[PDB]
């Protein structure tokens, strides 16, 4: 048949999230072909009939069977994010995020955090540096949380690989011993 994913991201692509199966054709929910226009919270048997619901486009994988997210898609489609994580060593450890991720106002910063529950929430954060096309979250948020950045990356697989096939604390690499 072919792979109908020949196109990639468009302009305005902040390289924080390429969305690998968080959009496009990944299980969003279940529907009965006799109940189109509905929105079931999750798979199961139809309440209107007694048949197992039919899955959308991809049909029964998406989160790799709980490997990924808890089968919830915290992806508002037109809104991408970037996860909080420390991006320096030796330098002064700060939470690195895309410069457009945070809200600058007055003499402080706000972050609309991507909460794991599939929602977005505003947080007052300390943010005042810029480094390498990114900004520094001095204080405010924690690693493992995300912020809204509305940009796309080329291949999101690298990022996706964290948390699915890869686990471990700090999730770092090429850092066995650090003395000198």
CA distance 55 to 27: 7
Tell me 53's DSSP state: P
Which of 8, 34, 52, 115 lies at the binding interface for Ag ion (CB under 5 A)?
34
From candidates 29, 31, 32, 72, binder to Ag ion by CB under 5 A: 32
The residue (of 32 and 63) whose beta carbon lies closer to Ag ion is 32
130 Cβ contact partners less than 8 Å away, ≥ 6 residues apart: 99, 136
Choices 12-20, 33-41, 79-87, 155-163; region in contact with Ag ion by CB under 5 A: 33-41
In angstroms, the Cα distances linking 80 to 14, 76, 106, 166, 170 are 9, 8, 25, 22, 23
Q: Pull the structure tokens for residue 49.
A: 């009939």
- Please, which residue, 49 or 143, has the CB nearer to Ag ion? 49
**Token pair for 151:** 């940009």
Shortest Cβ distance from residue 35 to Ag ion (Å)?
7
Q: How far is the CB of 52 from Ag ion (least distance, A)?
A: 10
In the complex, what is the shortest distance from the CB of residue 167 to Ag ion, in angstroms, rounded to a whole number? 40
**Binding residue for Ag ion, selected from 25, 42, 44, 49, defined by CB under 5 A:** 49
Residue 43 Cβ vs Ag ion, minimum distance, rounded to whole Å: 14
Beta carbon nearer to Ag ion, 52 or 118:
52
Q: How far apart are CA 32 and CA 56, in angstroms?
A: 10
Q: Which stretch binds Ag ion (CB under 5 A): 12-20, 46-54, 120-128, 140-148?
A: 46-54
Angle at 95 between CA 92 and CA 101, to 5 degrees: 135
CB count, 10 Å around CB of 3? 5
Name the one range near Ag ion by CB under 5 A: 41-49, 67-75, 90-98, 116-124: 41-49
Nearest C-alpha neighbor of 8 from the set 20, 125, 95: 20
Residues engaged in binding Ag ion (CB under 5 A)? 32, 34, 49
């Amino acid at each position: 048949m072919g792979s109908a994913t020949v196109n990639g991201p468009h302009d305005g692509h902040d390289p924080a999230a390429g969305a690998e199966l968080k959009t496009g054709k990944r299980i969003l929910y279940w529907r009965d072909p006799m109940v189109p226009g509905q929105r079931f919270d999750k798979p199961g048997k139809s309440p209107y009939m007694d048949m197992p619901l039919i899955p959308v486009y991809e049909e029964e994988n998406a989160d790799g069977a709980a490997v990924r997210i808890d089968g919830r898609v915290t992806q508002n489609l037109g809104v991408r994010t970037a996860e909080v994580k420390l991006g320096r060593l030796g330098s002064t450890e700060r939470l690195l995020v895309p410069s457009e991720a945070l809200i600058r106002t007055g003499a402080r910063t706000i972050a609309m955090v991507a909460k794991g529950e599939g929602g977005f929430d505003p947080v007052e954060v300390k943010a005042g540096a810029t480094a390498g096309g990114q900004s520094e979250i001095l204080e405010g948020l924690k690693a493992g949380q995300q912020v809204v950045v509305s940009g796309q990356f080329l291949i999101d697989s690298e990022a996706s690989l964290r948390g699915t096939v890869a686990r471990m604390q700090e999730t770092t690499s090429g850092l066995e011993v650090l003395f000198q």
